[PDB]
Amino acid sequence: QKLIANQFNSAIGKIQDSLSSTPSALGKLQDVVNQNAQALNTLVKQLS
Amino acid sequence: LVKNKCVNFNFNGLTGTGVLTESNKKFLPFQQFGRDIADTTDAVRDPQ
């Protein structure tokens, strides 16, 4: 139980490092932000 | 000239409708108009 608890606690610690050091992890959500911003910017530019 | 209040302006035949305000936009001496991404005139030099 102490081994399993320590492995869980250590693996939960690695999540913060993994997300912080990997910009391509959040890239699936950042692409939702980027696509909808790019679609509105294209719609505004088309008024010129 | 009326500022900070919504007005139906016309500068040198450039008709529009908006709130005019003073601005920090550093127009170079040759420039009379400034344009937005949508080509809408975004600032004007007052001709008087």
Torsion angle of C-alpha atoms B23, B25, B28, B29, degrees rounded to 10: 0
Q: Which helix (H) or strand (E) holds A30?
A: helix A27-45
Torsion angle of C-alpha atoms A24, A26, A28, A29, degrees rounded to 10: -150
- Nominal resolution in Å? 2.8
Distance CA B29, CA B34 (A): 12
> Can you tell me which residue has the tokens 């608890």?
A5
CA distance B39 to chain A (A): 5
Q: Which amino acid is at B27?
A: F
Q: What b/e readout covers B2-12, taking b as 16+ CB neighbours within 10 angstroms?
A: eeeeeeebebe
* Cβ pair B37, A43 in contact under 8 A: no
Q: Give the single-character DSSP code of B33.
A: E
Method: cryo-EM
Residues of chain A contacting B, Cβ within 8 Å: 41, 44-45, 47-48
